Design a protein around this ligand. Structure first.
Ligand SMILES: Cc1ccc2c(C(=O)O)c[nH]c2c1
Length: 126
């Protein structure tokens, strides 16, 4: 059901947290080859996460589940902010701008946390 889809979306989000934290450690340690691979894997994880979120939102709309639709619209808007920040982080890595990369790492953590505040209301709405 939409809940098994929620559970997979939540798990993909958690996988991205895990890989992000490994990548932050690799960035701090100066292991650029690792950072490159973790960024590629994060890109794939965020693409999958977005796919699942869109299926959940479309299913909620087709059900006419107004509260789930509202929460999912809010969550996905914050998710898109995070993706913009992620993209900027990737560009800072490409450009060799470690100062900006550090800053974006911090911003992405805060934007991710902002969206997660909605997750527990989403689960009970769907
Ligand atoms: C790179 C990648 C892509 C998709 C998934 C996934 C999923 O589709 O549920 C779980 N971990 C992943 C990791």
């Amino acid at each position: 059901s939409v809940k098994s889809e929620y559970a997979e979306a939540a798990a993909v989000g958690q996988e991205a947290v895990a890989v992000f934290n490994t990548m932050k450690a690799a960035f701090q340690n100066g292991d650029k080859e690792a950072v490159a691979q973790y960024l590629a894997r994060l890109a794939s994880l965020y693409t999958r996460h977005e796919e699942l979120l869109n299926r959940i939102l479309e299913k909620a709309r087709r059900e006419g589940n107004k509260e789930a639709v509202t929460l999912m619209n809010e969550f996905t808007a914050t998710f898109q902010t995070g993706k913009s920040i992620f993209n900027a982080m990737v560009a800072a890595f490409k450009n060799g701008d470690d100062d900006s990369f550090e800053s974006y790492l911090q911003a992405l953590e805060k934007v991710t946390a902002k969206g997660e505040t909605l997750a527990d209301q989403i689960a009970k709405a769907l």
